[PDB]
């Protein structure tokens, strides 16, 4: 599982469930070509976005739809979304877990990168 | 006064100096128009990007060039950049401070929004 | 497993392995009585600190020895340790996961609290 | 100038006003001696705790009463308080800004340490 997203809710103290996540790869012309999406599970996790073979070196964008999450809880948010943009696999294939810690006016994104 | 960016280095506990920041605004056609740019000072702050009259309602994107900051310190960080995307001034003029806390594999962004 | 600690390293992008963790319960006289300790595993996790029966309502302190972790990596740290102090089980027994995101001059502690 | 505490509310994107802060210093016998105290102003800042001459080398503890802040807003938060424990001035006098970013189930603390 080369790419995993985990989302936590710092207001409720819970996994952030049903958060939509879209993944893009930067194209030759510098445009973003959306290619894996999903929604987080009851544990706040989204597994299964891509496979080893398809997840070649490149620049990737993970867009986490935080604004829809906070709207569905009735809480005003600041950001339109939380993006994470990174170059993948530059030194070989890696497994990436992106941990997003969400508050309405703040978030953090951390990568845990492990070698298979 | 209406938009200020503050960048801090969480490894050294210091302002992140000379960090490039580019601000864009979403046009009516949905493209990202360049809006303003600058670099952080010795205090890690970037003041003077815009004016109350030019900073009208809209969706703005702040991209902070965190990769070049780390690369100049010899580090190959995770994130290509830190980007903050938000609707501004939707209920009248506000002052926005965007705080970014940088680590090689993590970043934290917070908005402090005040009504002048 | 009523209490789990997960520690991440934002400088390397990895679980923080071999981090010492001590757990205390506040005594009747307001002193801290240390009672579960352990060290994080290769996944940055520490499971098995306490059991359902023993983890009664009370105020608990989790001390994470961040300073020793950063010293063992050769990196100067700011904090002596990261503490987390919380009242447990005030509305019934819960499972607590404490997520600590570590940088040398910054950290965050988040609780994910789930009902069994 | 030598110690300032800044507290921000990540739910509202605002300074956290009227937050009580107590500072202690570890004595030669290992007890925590009261050192100074104050409350955050309308800007979320607490200035004036100490002086360069009184703030000698030592281990200091800053406890921020985050629980009472949340309780006054109707919220039962996770943490009893946010406590920052650090050695100060070990290589000569420095200026310390302790930044705390608060959410009901998370807090982020960062030290910015400058040499005047």
Author numbering:
A (entry chain A), B (entry chain B), C (entry chain A), D (entry chain B): 10 to 125
The authors write:
TTR is a homotetrameric plasma protein that carries L-thyroxine (T4)8 and vitamin A910. The TTR molecule is composed of four identical 127 amino acid subunits, named A, B, C and D. Each monomer consists of eight strands in a β-pleated sheet conformation. The weaker dimer-dimer interface defines two, largely unoccupied, funnel-shaped T4-binding sites. Pathogenic mutations affect the native TTR stability, facilitating the dissociation of the tetramer into monomers that, upon partial unfolding, aggregate into amyloid fibrils.
Here, we identified a novel A108V non-pathogenic mutation in a Portuguese subject. Because the side chain of Ala 108 is involved in the three TTR HBP sites, we speculated that this mutation would impact the protein stability. The crystal structure of this mutant and the characterization of its stability in vitro and in human plasma confirms TTR A108V as the third described natural variant displaying increased stability relative to TTR WT, being more stable in vitro than TTR T119M. In good agreement with the measured stability in plasma, TTR A108V was predicted to be 8.30 kcal.mol−1 more stable than the WT protein. This over-stabilization seemed to result from the projection of the additional methylene group of Val into the T4 binding channel at the tetrameric interface. To dissect unambiguously the molecular details accounting for the higher stability of the natural and designed TTR variants, we solved the crystal structures of both TTR A108V and TTR A108I homotetramers at 1.3 and 1.4 Å resolution, respectively. Regarding to the tetrameric assemblies, the major finding on the TTR A108V and TTR A108I structures is a significant reduction of the volume of the ligand-binding hydrophobic cavity and the formation of a few novel interactions, namely between side chains of Val/Ile108 and Leu110 (3.80 Å), between Val/Ile108 and Thr106 (3.95 Å) inside the same monomer, and between Ile108 and Leu17Symm (3.58 Å). In addition to the formation of these novel interactions, it is remarkable the reduction of the hydrophobic cavity that binds T4 and other hydrophobic compounds, which is partially occupied in our TTR variants by the aliphatic side chains of Val108 or Ile108, leading to formation of a much closer AC/BD interface in the tetrameric assembly. These different interfaces in the TTR variants result in the decrease of the distance between the methyl groups of Cδ1 of Leu17Symm with Cβ2 of Ala108 (at 7.80 Å distance), with Cγ2 of Val108 (at 4.25 Å distance), and with Cδ1 of Ile108 (at 3.58 Å distance). Likewise, whereas the dimer interface area between AB and CD remains unvariable, there is a significant increase in the AC/BD dimer-dimer contact area in the tetrameric assembly, with a relative increase of around 7% and 13% for the TTR A108V and TTR A108I mutant variants, respectively.
